[PDB]
Design a protein around this ligand. Structure first.
Ligand SMILES: [Ca+2]
Ligand SMILES: [Zn+2]
Lengths: 603, 240
């Protein structure tokens, strides 16, 4: 290049002097065009569009977000990716991948705390500094010796910044969504965003090959998911964005992680309370953003539905499990639940629960303990988290089949004429049923019940096989009608869109459930022993109100295995940088941008 | 195109004159090196050597063996590799990496038990097949319950297979050494090879998590190592 510079210096002076005498110092672009047409005179057009692509960079360039998605999805550490990059860079001569600092900039553009924004109300008790990332989850606790001891490790994001980064991630999708729904690319807000709210612990995360049992080491995440986005034009609203898979593992963006027990109450609420404060400050605010070159405004709505049963009974203030109070919507006792089957409503709310707890504190009528216990309907603790509860179809049909197995046990028992039996007589009845189902169905019995055995039990042919063993075929007709009502009721909560999929089955729901209640209360009037499952109470009573409220009934070892993967593969030690690392890599794993690049094979 | 051609017709005819007067109708290399010098003075050299590789004729895709090398050296599973391969194929359009078929093909090429060879002695108590690799280390130890009971799993090669495979992939090294130390390629042997051997146990190799410490399971590899290849020609020998 030095001797080429010596042979080409005069020509270089001439081309730069034409550049500054025609364009004004634009030697690069004119050099591009003259070399391009110098190749175009030899009709090698493949190389011409190739040079267009490499000046475009969209050829074999690999924009750093793509290889970042590759490294995150394939679980590569830094040294190995550096090895792969330098080896392919050496063997091809061209630099097809990217180096590490560009990868760090490409990940710094996707973390929380990068884009600017503001809020039309000034967001009381929130620091308006706009470049905060992973902060300490303890919000400045009091870890000194003279204080209450707490040895947990919690790392969190601020709520608003993570919401902002999630919206900036789904920016391109919401652009093409509002294009596809026959509207303009220019449109001010307000976009109203409905957000799923969830929390769950992932059990044990310890890995000890020996040294006895090491540590139980329970931990728990707190996460959210953007469910749907909507917008009006004048008075007509439109769903501008809907999510296809709500409960999947690729759309659960985490706020905070802590290594703590799920039931360790005070530490849990002490870490989770400032995020609650941020949520309630955010409930009555207005976000303003600059995504599509123009400002947009945002309101928000939060649905706390992603909780499980033991946790919602714990963090709202109810009894754990051993009460007479089983319904988290209706105040029906266990006594009345066996008695009244469907005629209830939804009567539990947050503010009245606060009022009931204040009644439990004050005790204004100086009554005794048990009448307080039935007056407040199981309210014992101060409520501190708003939560709208729901169900899932696995618990519904597993409670159904757990009833039905006992129904067939009493049906082979002929217990209507044997008012008592020995327990081992019922064990022999059960064992004859087991031999019977193995000899007819070829089914393998098991004491534990999962969704699989429960789902493959409910067939017309198996209920035919079990009613063929019993005489008095009015019993066969009774279980036939009963199974018919069951299979009618099944795809209602087994559709995920029952307002649209099976509206005929959605209608006549109170009609068929009242029929089935009349069947169980009159014909099979021997199950009435007071034993009733809360799952069954929810399937009988609390179905259609949940349906008209939401419209849906929409993987245990999922977060924990992935958490062990992140902790073991790519992590720093000392228990301080570790949680920041797994939190950051989890947030990078959960981006819509990277997954959208990652599954490009289907196109 | 015709507009900028009209704008730069003087430039085209000017460097046309300069190409005829400097190197005699050599517009291609002159205009190319002008682009290279300009875009390297731009200090954005990734585009520059990309254009250099594409105008030299450097191939985009690569050998299967290099994919095998980087896969082994990074310790990656076939699932994640296949995901990476299909993503780069979907993004780039053209294919650069390889799928698993040619990988396993070049693998069994490089594996022992594939290439023919012979022995001038007949090698008593040794089989005649040249195409057996991995076998049981038990050598037909009947482990029925009526006999002495063991449980030690043992896998092994055949020794001569390992020797000939080690020779065939050090073949390029000994070729370069023969070209370095003043000889030809058309030499015959007998090449004298010095081989040391070793085995050592490694202590526990187990990750027991069902209940903690189950068994200190001790394993042991047995291995060989070449360290010297020589040839004696005429009077003396030479460490090739
Ligand atoms: Ca040793
Ligand atoms: Zn209820």
């Amino acid at each position: 290049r030095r001797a080429q510079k010596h042979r080409l210096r005069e020509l270089k002076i001439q081309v730069k002097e034409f550049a500054d005498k025609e364009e004004g110092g634009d030697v690069k672009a004119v050099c591009l065009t003259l070399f391009l047409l110098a190749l175009r005179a030899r009709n090698e057009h493949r190389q011409a569009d190739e040079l267009e692509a490499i000046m475009q960079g969209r050829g074999s360039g690999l924009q750093p977000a793509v290889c970042l998605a590759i490294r995150v999805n394939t679980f590569l550490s830094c040294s190995q990716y550096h090895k792969m990059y330098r080896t392919v860079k050496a063997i091809t001569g061209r630099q097809i991948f990217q180096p590490l600092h560009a990868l760090r900039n490409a990940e710094k553009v996707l973390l929380p705390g990068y884009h600017p924004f503001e809020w039309q109300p000034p967001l009381k008790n929130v620091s308006s500094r706009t470049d905060v990332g992973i902060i300490d989850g303890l919000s400045g606790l009091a870890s000194s010796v003279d204080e209450y001891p707490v040895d947990t490790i919690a790392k969190r994001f601020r709520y608003d910044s993570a919401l902002v980064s999630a919206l900036m991630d789904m920016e391109e999708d919401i652009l093409e969504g509002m294009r596809s729904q026959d509207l303009d690319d220019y449109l001010n807000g307000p976009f109203t965003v409905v957000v799923k709210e969830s929390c769950d612990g992932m059990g044990d995360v310890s890995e000890k090959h020996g040294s006895g049992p090491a540590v139980p080491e329970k931990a728990v995440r707190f996460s959210f998911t953007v469910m749907r986005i909507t917008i009006e034009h004048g008075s007509q609203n439109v769903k501008v964005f809907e999510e296809p898979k709500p409960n999947s593992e690729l759309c659960c963006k985490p706020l905070c992680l802590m290594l703590a027990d799920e039931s360790d109450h005070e530490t849990l609420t002490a870490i989770l309370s400032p995020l609650i404060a941020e949520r309630e400050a955010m409930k009555s605010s207005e976000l303003t953003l600059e995504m599509g070159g123009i400002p947009r405004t945002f309101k928000f709505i939060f649905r706390g539905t992603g909780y499980d049963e033991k946790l919602v009974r714990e963090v709202e203030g109810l009894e754990a499990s051993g009460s007479v109070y089983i319904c988290t919507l209706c105040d029906t006792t266990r006594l009345e639940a066996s008695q009244n089957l469907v005629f209830h409503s939804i009567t539990r709310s947050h503010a009245e629960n606060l009022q009931r707890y204040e009644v439990w504190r004050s005790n204004p009528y100086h009554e005794s303990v048990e009448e307080l216990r039935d007056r407040v309907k199981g309210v014992s603790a101060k409520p501190f988290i708003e939560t709208v509860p729901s169900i899932d179809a696995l618990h519904c049909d597993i409670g159904n089949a757990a009833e039905f197995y006992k129904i067939f046990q009493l049906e082979i028992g002929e217990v209507y004429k044997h008012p008592n039996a020995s327990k081992e007589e019922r064990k022999r009845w059960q064992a004859t049923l087991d031999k019977h189902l193995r000899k007819r169905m070829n089914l393998k019995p098991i004491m534990r019940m999962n969704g699989n055995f429960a789902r493959k039990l409910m067939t017309q042919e198996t209920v035919d096989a079990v009613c063929e063993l019993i005489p008095s075929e009015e019993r066969h007709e009774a279980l036939r009608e009963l199974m018919d009502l069951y299979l009618k009721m099944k795809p209602v909560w087994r559709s995920s869109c029952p307002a649209k999929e099976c509206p005929e089955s959605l209608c006549q729901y109170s009609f068929n459930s009242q029929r089935f209640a009349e069947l169980l209360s009159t014909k099979f009037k021997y199950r009435y022993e007071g034993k009733i499952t809360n799952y069954f109470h929810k399937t009988l009573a609390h179905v259609p109100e949940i349906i008209e409220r939401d419209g849906s009934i929409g993987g245990n070892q999922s977060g924990n295995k992935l958490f062990r993967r992140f902790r073991k593969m790519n992590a720093r030690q000392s228990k301080c940088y570790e949680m920041e690392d797994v939190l950051k890599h989890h947030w990078l794993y959960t981006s819509k941008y990277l997954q959208k690049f990652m599954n490009a094979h289907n196109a």
